[PDB]
A paper describes a structure:
To further understand the role of ATP hydrolysis in OCCM-to-SH transition, we assembled a DH loading reaction using MCM-Cdt1 bearing the Mcm5RA variant. 3D classification identified two distinct states of a complex containing ORC-Cdt1-MCM but lacking Cdc6 (OC1MMcm5RA). While all ORC subunits are visible, the two states differ in the configuration of Orc1. In one state, the full Orc1 subunit is visible, and its ATPase domain is flexible yet still engaged to the neighbouring Orc4 subunit. Mcm5 establishes new contacts with DNA downstream of the Mcm2 DNA binding sites and away from ORC.
ATP binding supports formation of the ORC-Cdc6-Cdt1-MCM (OCCM) helicase-recruitment complex where ORC-Cdc6 and one MCM hexamer form two juxtaposed rings around duplex DNA. MCM is a ring-shaped helicase containing six related AAA+ ATPase polypeptides featuring bipartite active sites with catalytic residues contributed by neighbouring subunits.
Numbering used by the authors:
A (entry chain 2): 183 to 458, 475 to 709, 739 to 864
B (entry chain 5): 23 to 106, 133 to 193, 204 to 213, 236 to 303, 320 to 335, 349 to 517
C (entry chain 6): 100 to 123, 134 to 200, 260 to 420, 445 to 463, 500 to 509
D (entry chain 8): 15 to 158, 186 to 207, 220 to 433
The structure:
Amino acid sequence: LESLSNVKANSYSEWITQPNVSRTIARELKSFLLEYTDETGRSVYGARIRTLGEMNSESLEVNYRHLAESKAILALFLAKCPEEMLKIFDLVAMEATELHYPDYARIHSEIHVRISDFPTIYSLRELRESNLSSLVRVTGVVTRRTGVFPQLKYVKFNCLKCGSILGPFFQDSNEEIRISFCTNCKSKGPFRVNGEKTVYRNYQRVTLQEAPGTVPPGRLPRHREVILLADLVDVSKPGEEVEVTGIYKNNYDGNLNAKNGFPVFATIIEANSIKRSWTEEEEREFRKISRDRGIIDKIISSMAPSIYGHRDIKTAVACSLFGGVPKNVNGKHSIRGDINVLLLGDPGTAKSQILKYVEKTAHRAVFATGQGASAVGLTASVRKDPITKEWTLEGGALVLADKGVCLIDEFDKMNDQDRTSIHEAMEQQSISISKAGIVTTLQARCSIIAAANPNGGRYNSTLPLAQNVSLTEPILSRFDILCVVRDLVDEEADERLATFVVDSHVRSHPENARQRRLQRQRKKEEEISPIPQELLMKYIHYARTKIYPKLHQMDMDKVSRVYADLRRESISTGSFPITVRHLESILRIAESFAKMRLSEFVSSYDLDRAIKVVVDSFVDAQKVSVRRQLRRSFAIY
Amino acid sequence: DNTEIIKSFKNFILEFRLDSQFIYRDQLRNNILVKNYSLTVNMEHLIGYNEDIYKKLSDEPSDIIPLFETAITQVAKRISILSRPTFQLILNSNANQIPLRDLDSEHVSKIVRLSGIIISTSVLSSRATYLSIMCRNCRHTTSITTVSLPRSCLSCGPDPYIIIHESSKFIDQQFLKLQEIPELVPVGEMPRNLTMTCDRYLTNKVIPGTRVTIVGIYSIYNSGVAIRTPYIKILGIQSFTEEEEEEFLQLSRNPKLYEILTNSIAPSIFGNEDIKKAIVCLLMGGSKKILPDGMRLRGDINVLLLGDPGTAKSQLLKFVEKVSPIAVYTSGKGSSAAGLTASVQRDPMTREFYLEGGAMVLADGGVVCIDEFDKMRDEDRVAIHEAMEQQTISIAKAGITTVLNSRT
Amino acid sequence: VKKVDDVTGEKVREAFEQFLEDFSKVYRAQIEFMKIYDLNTIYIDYQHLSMRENGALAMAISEQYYRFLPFLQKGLRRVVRKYAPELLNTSERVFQISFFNLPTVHRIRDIRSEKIGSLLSISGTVTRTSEVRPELYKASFTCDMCRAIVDNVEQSFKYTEPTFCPNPSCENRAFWTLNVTRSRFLDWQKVRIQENANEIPTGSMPRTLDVILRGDSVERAKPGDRCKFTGVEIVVPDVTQLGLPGVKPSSTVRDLTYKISFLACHVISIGDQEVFLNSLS
Amino acid sequence: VPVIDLNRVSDEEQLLPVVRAILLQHDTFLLKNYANKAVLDALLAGLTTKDLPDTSQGFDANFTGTLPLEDDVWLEQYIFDTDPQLRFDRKCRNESLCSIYSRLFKLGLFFAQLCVKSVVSSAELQDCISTSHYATKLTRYFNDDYVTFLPTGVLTIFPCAKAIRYVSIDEPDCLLFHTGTLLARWSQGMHTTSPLQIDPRANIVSLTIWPPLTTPISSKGEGTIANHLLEQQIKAFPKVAQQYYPRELSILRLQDAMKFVKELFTVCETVLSLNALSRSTGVPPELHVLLPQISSMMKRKIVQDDILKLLTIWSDAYVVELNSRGELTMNLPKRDNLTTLTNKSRTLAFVERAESWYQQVIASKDEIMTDVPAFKINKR
Ligand SMILES: Nc1ncnc2c1ncn2[C@@H]1O[C@H](COP(=O)(O)OP(=O)(O)O)[C@@H](O)[C@H]1O
Ligand SMILES: Nc1ncnc2c1ncn2[C@@H]1O[C@H](COP(=O)(O)OP(=O)(O)O)[C@@H](O)[C@H]1O
Ligand SMILES: [Zn+2]
Ligand SMILES: [Zn+2]
Ligand SMILES: [Zn+2]
């Protein structure tokens, strides 16, 4: 038959299960696999099948749009009963593969087809009962990963009252199947699984958590159990961000009907395909922006527009947002690619609300308070698995912020042990742990932005930095940029700040309507920033994703002499622990400056601005009597 | 049909000749003289002797290994009768080992080869190997060699039989925990553990922290919807190319070898030649000596980096952890005495308390890298005193006390 | 064979259908709105329910709500078939009723066994919450001896297998195969609340209670919120009654313990000039 | 990428099976150990360091000469054909370029003949390229962001196989051989080719080979190969075509918009079908909700104007009623929500409408605009 499956006599399951309809759609699927219209590209699926047989793998990726275009209702059936369609489509793929490479079943039992580019995406919080048993595509962050264990797939039973063997039953991962009548005895006697004639499968369970920047206000993070089957194991590890496509099914049957009041179950997602990306229209506008002369100043002015002044802090914030190059030189050596910033100053200097801009600007940001954090909580926590009862580990805030930024407010007032827990994370970008027999190291590739208050609550300008804070030289050495702020009084500066703040409070006050309100919002953004903020976010993401400037030794002296000058001026004064780690800060911040221009090379101008920032940061932290001398000692730079 | 398999095993034992000697017959005779009822069969000789029985064993050993046991027992009894219990099969092999992470639902009931480190061992358990039973209703007796008692009498009601304890035999069994080498585990992953079981002469041969090579059968047992716990029937445990030997001997013959290796330690760092050479000495390590009173001299070299921050002190340890063949890296803050050293924990798979090794136990025979050492607690330091100076770890938890060695 | 009928329930259903047909037809507009926007639950103002037959209908419905609810559900589904049959379509007649705007609000202090099976409204500060789950509202089973199917097996507060095979040619009992496709489910959530500060006098400790929410009303309760609930009190089995003094009744041996929980259908959180001003006389 | 080595495969009986096997599966292959490669390296060095292009030559309607481009990039292009009927009088002015061209041609003519014998089943065209009948285009970029291009020749030859993308090619010691549109067209389905991406500022010289351009594209068509090359150059170089071929440029450009609107309709069908099957009711959703998903499927930004362009061609496509919110909506017009046969029928109806409108536009005597005007929904 053909086109006769379009008749809607009843719900889709009542029609698909009919053997004639199944044969018709299997023939249609075979036609789709054998021939597809990709013009100059020929039938790409044939080449895919041939190369899969060549590569000895089971993954036949199928573009949803292709099948939808070629066969209208054939894709819609998969969109509402994915399991039933895949059940026969696996056999169709298997025979198609055996056409090119015979005896494929001699090694591979089945073909695990994977769906790609499914056009409907739901969050982990948007799932509803109306989408039960349907195909869904969700995006989340891997938090906890269980082991890989075998699980039954086709089960046969042995009757106790006869030597006959019961027929095969498919394990849907829904319930521990227990038959009630023997096919020969018709008795309700005991049954036992015939293991020697039973086919298994691999099983793994992974929890997907809401992305750190996507948690709604005032609610705990949502998460679901995701089941990885059919060689889909080890596709992700804790800290990774993935998007997965699967089936929304219910399998928590058992004592829950009596332990908790009334009969209830719990939902899981059984994963079909998983994936761990820019259109031309976005790259064109990015490249239009990149060619503007002096783009660096616009970017710097774009950070936290409503905060007046503090340009020497805004530049550091922007540089940390863009970051540098994590040069894993020759593999055997590594350098952290991210810039660490400390905001130290008097109260009433917005050392905290800047972090409330990094949290809203960076792709993935984690915020914590000094006394509201624990060493176990930040790094990693130990858990016992509810299924396997084994010791398991769950990542903390630093593991969550992997390939992101971690924020710690009131960094000075946290207890010493929680502060010590940050030592390894600040340089190794990793968490090393040994608890309950678990020995492992997680990736913690994140930058740290810290805000703190000086000893006594007010900065003593007459005393060095190494005396105004309760911190120590080790901890200070893990930073790159130190921003010291004085709340000194002056009529002109105070008038400027007040007239900026009052207009900021006038702006932020409330007062195709969607388009009109977006236009008005962008008008207000233009009134205060040179770059639209959504474009800035996309630009930052694109720069972090694509641009990796390289270095040249054209200006070796200009950096070496600056390093020597700083070391000489730090020889006998209480000041920053200037070391090789601080030398690397110049290079990394120069790389960050270059990455704003999207240039592939580190230029002399970038190094000039880098040297300016580092030298100014070092100088502005010395005592008053020496500051006015070092002002003139470094007049060259 | 299986009589041919038994005959083939009999030929492979009695008549197989290597190095102009009946090596298998002679070794089985020597074991009988020693009264060790076990035979160490080498798979590399078995494949060379007969390929068909090797194919059967590789594909369906389920009936082959009972045949192995009974044939070896019969042949050994014949040899004992000629010269004047069930003999255990031990397999030695050198074929390629499948990685532990690659074990899947396809290798069910197949004999595989593995390598790893032992992290925990259970206490011995007594299992039945031959039983004689009597019916309580009519005193009828019979013998039985998973096994379960008959439901009806052979002469009485359901379940009439009881076990005659004074006319039965039992054997020992031990449960083992294997995991992959942490050096082969990429960061961001906890090494996979694996349950193994051994019986009779294969028990008590390893302790936690031991690195072994395994020949065994991949199988599952019931203890999640259908998550059947996998376990390994242990069959044989074992614990450089000639051109590589020549290359490394020439490297030793290099007149500038010491300086070359000194520069080779973290070449991407400048100077620090003294600490570089000290770390080289740590990597080589000292030589063990034993006093005539039985005490052992600790040959490990322990070095404390106690300088100003930012002097590449962490980078050196992170580089050594790459270089040393056995290396463990952990922070002082994120570790504990129960984690750094051994601990006693209950195994949920066998419902028994297990002695489990710690991080420093895993680093036995290697080097451990620890950072922020000043920030660990004093109890951990006290345990590390024993680990450093006596190469032992003393455990006194719950109601059990034990001492475990650690050459870290 | 004719089953026993509740004539009072039939009168209540008829009065409820007449109320739906005659009230002004804002509720029929609500039904159409649900059809347009694909909505599962209809909402009824209690003061609208209490303005027909001098509110005697509302009183009768409230005081035995757990009994009369099926009749109102039948009336509403008959009405929706009369006017919006497309809501019976799936891809199969899941439908909920939620009453709101109760006149009286009762404290956790004033919980009594007399209130069981009656409509009432309570308020309390939320302290702990559990994640949402699916609940088996109505299940269906297929026979094991033969292959007959049994639909509309309502699971009243317990896992309930069918008591017989409908065809007399089969002798199946105590064994069934559960369907997970033709069966339908609903959302489930439990809210653990605390007595408010202004209720407890000085020197008195606050009372705690567990509240049950189902359907789309879930997740509208947040910790620290002075939420308000509307529904009926229901008792649930309890295991902590063991060891208490006094004679305990027995069934014949079986146990018959109980503890009290509140089931709420409507959720609201207590908290723009004209919006506030239009709510005042 | 397959590699051909003259030290082991240099004979016709050796090359022909290898070339046929490569072309039955690939469109690009490499040449190794060619004797002139050592001289080719020195000639390339001389061109890129001493023999700079003659920037004063200018550019003509024949797409030959030294065309200035954006970012001060210069393009030196020459065309040669054995048939005198085409006036390619602008021969190459530089002797080093001719030295590279001759050394390329000496083996490239034989390789093109081998490819034609391998994949072209037409016995009348087995020797369509030879010393007596051949046409070549010499191309040289110069600098005083990859560009996608598709040669129309039988074979394309590059003296250096570096920085070329399709995955990148990094084989400097091998020459790159790429098949064009004509060879695949005459292959009768036995061989296909794909466009390449190259750096326009890399100063790379390239050669492409055709039979004499007066040869028709096929016996089934009236236009010649020169017409196809002219179409390709007009599409590639609008600035040059403006002086000489404006109307042809507009006609050629409108086809891209036609394909765009067709694929937009194809995407919208799937989007609306999935929206309809995800609801128990047929209420039309607001357009602004559908737009992100539509743009994601299209893999480029889609706006309301592009949607309204569809209504211009096929009025019976969708129902576009405006919601009480003031937000535009769209829905399927069919009462019984969908049928695959009716879906194909509606797609074919839109295709027919688009083709008829394209023919109407190109038949007009007025100058053609290259974009479909947008429909206006009646304001309420
Ligand atoms: N430089 C500034 N420009 C504008 N507003 C500022 C500035 N510094 C502080 N403020 C205002 O003062 C408040 C400071 O908040 P907070 O960041 O907690 O101060 P700090 O962290 O410095 O103690 C902010 O709400 C901000 O509006
Ligand atoms: N001699 C050196 N050569 C190269 N890099 C060095 C040298 N000394 C220090 N460094 C730099 O210092 C960093 C290591 O600092 P580290 O020892 O981790 O700080 P801390 O002592 O606070 O742990 C590395 O990034 C490395 O590049
Ligand atoms: Zn039976
Ligand atoms: Zn008996
Ligand atoms: Zn029945």
